[PDB]
Amino acid sequence: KNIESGVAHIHSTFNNTIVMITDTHGNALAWSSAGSLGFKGSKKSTPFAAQMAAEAATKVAMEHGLKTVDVTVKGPGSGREAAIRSLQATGLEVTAIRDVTPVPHXGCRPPKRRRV
């Protein structure tokens, strides 16, 4: 119901950006994404859509009561920063920013190149 510390997971891919705000224990509290704000197609991948997604999820998160979050950024999407700053704007206190992009230490064979 009422939290004081949390973490905001910015899952930003090439196609879409999902913003998920959890408590420090990883339990979800609020989440938004470019797709759930009406953005479709390439628009979902833009920094502005990432910005709007962060705002909509931030405001819901602060309705619960939540002051300061740390940010984990993942994926190659262009909207990582626009989300990080949007968190600060809408009211949250961004204390730390980390990169948690998974990296195989090799790992599995990736899919084929998109031509031929």
Next chain:
RNA sequence: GGGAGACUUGAGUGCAGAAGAGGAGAGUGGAAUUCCAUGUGUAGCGGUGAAAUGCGUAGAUAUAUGGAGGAACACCAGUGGC
């Protein structure tokens, strides 16, 4: 060229060292993917030039904690090595 000798440079042995993803066998490590279980959580997720098929309110994706299994070995790493 054949025969009987002699020789130490070619070739090999000894002795002393040097480096190495050379090979074979048996173990073993972490990262990641997938699946599985359990919380949290809510309507999307995924994808393209643009879309749709697909997946999701029988609760997804995300996120947290674990479990299983397979394959490949980030950095080191280099017209570097064998």
